[model samples]
Target chain A: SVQIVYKPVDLSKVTSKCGSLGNIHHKPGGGQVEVKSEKLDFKDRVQSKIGSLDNITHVPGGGNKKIETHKLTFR
Target chain B: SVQIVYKPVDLSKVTSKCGSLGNIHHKPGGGQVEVKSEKLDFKDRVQSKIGSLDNITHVPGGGNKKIETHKLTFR
Candidate 1:
């Protein structure tokens, strides 16, 4: 199951606007991934990295992933 | 393709808090279905009705759905 793993985003690092973030890993035995992003201009970059959300649905077994949309703030 | 169909939410009907909303229908001939909201306390109800989002992933062909999250505002 390719579940979503959330990271404790450092507010000082990412941005003051970022409410939260998550990462999705693609591999077997790869339980989960935690990314404490310290990126520049993190808002656009954070959403940009949600490539897994746009990932192909046909991954053979066809499993569902969890989504804990942490405090959506598009401001 | 089970795509996300959005409805022009009537502010007068739903509520002031509703940013936007979408509906997902379950059928074959249904290319898409549009729903106009005229409900009380629509925020919780609208999110609750996103049943398709939580539907089983093992839907045979395992197709992906399009998501245009309408102005996410959890305020």
Candidate 2:
């Protein structure tokens, strides 16, 4: 079964807005994907990506590889 | 505030696979949208669309409009 995995780097910042930011790997495969905040304003990029996939009912376990990278600007 | 509205057709077929299939209209505006099953394998299309939105935390109320149409094959 395929599931979502979340791993965060910072442990002190609890008040800031953050959620499970990690790679969603599909079974039987692997790859590298980078979601740059500067390239697409991070939030907008994430919304578009997820909306696109959900629109067609394509879950993360669709044999597709993806990676997400971001910075911890909140301190 | 924005929320998901589900309007299902044909209530007798409960055993069959079905869920809240309807248009997700963002507040403060509206538009015409169609999610056709013939254009793409219905399920696949739905997944892709939803996954895409959720990818970036883009909720339905992001000033975007959508419409969903499906058939009740089960009887």
Candidate 3:
């Protein structure tokens, strides 16, 4: 699966700000950083769309649901 | 400390979705990605609430409390 870093400056005016991080420097098993906009509407959808990097299932303990950023890195 | 990834579908409807990666491959020093939903109000409160990832204590400034993604990675 191809993983890249995405970021967004604002979410109120713009619904989302996402795009590929060009060529992925990290290997399949290496850690990659995905910087998402804090203003995206459908986060789960975007997350699921990430495919192999998809780690959205349950809450990360007691805090709020952030995103699934640790899909294939730690293995 | 055990870090996990989290994501939310709809903030108005569902509260949060979180869980831990079943298999732990990353060592203590290796980097583990932590994705957090942004809608959770009282970010300052929620951030401080999660203590295991004690690094959550410090706010990056000039933005929201996204999450500590690089603490255990770069020496």
Candidate 4:
């Protein structure tokens, strides 16, 4: 069964939110995937990676996943 | 095509809160479907089953049928 994995992409490494951004995978399958980020910031990105997945429903106040694959690959 | 059907096993019936707990379908095809619950409860047992179909990416997460039936049933 195909499942989702998570990994905290230290954006601090990706680029720089100007000062000190933090960690961010900046990659398709690499980054923080919070389940329900009320901020609505990661919706598009989330859906994009979700790909052909159906519904792709998002819980209102839920957790997130960093990296997703056949398993919960966290690095 | 098959599809995703979520069913939460009632920990109460399976067990109990020492007090009194309400009733839960404990069945997939039939049950009280709740959207999202925080508290990080049913994560591991969340993604139970997904009704499968032609991805038919034929469409997106816009809208679909509630009681999707094929010629096999729902005639």
Cα lDDT computed for each candidate against the true fold: 0.24, 0.25, 0.28, 0.23
lDDT of 2 by residue, B1-75 (tens): 222223333222111111222324232121222332222212222223322122223222212122333322211
Q: Which ten residues in a row have the lowest lDDT in candidate 1 chain B?
A: B12-21
Q: Alpha carbon lDDT of residue B39, candidate 2?
A: 25
In candidate 1, the residue pairs with backbone N, CA or C atoms under 3 Å apart (3 or more residues apart, or in different chains) clash, namely: none
iRMSD, all candidates: 30.3, 28.4, 29.6, 29.4
* DockQ of model 1, rounded to 2 decimals: 0.02
DockQ of each: 0.02, 0.03, 0.03, 0.02
Docking class of 3: incorrect
Cα lDDT tens digits, model 2, A1-75, are 323223333222111112222324232221222333222222222222222222223222212112324322211
In model 1, state the lDDT of residue B47: 22
Per-residue C-alpha lDDT of model 4 across residues A1-75, encoded as one tens digit per residue: 433323223222111111111223221222222334232322122212222122222222211112322222122
lDDT of 1 at A37: 30
lDDT of model 4 at position B22: 30
Which predicted model would earn the best TM-score?
Answer: 3
TM-score of each: 0.14, 0.15, 0.17, 0.12
Fill in the DockQ of model 4: 0.02
Model 3 has an lDDT value of 0.28
lDDT of 2 at A38: 28
The CAPRI classification for model 2 reads as incorrect
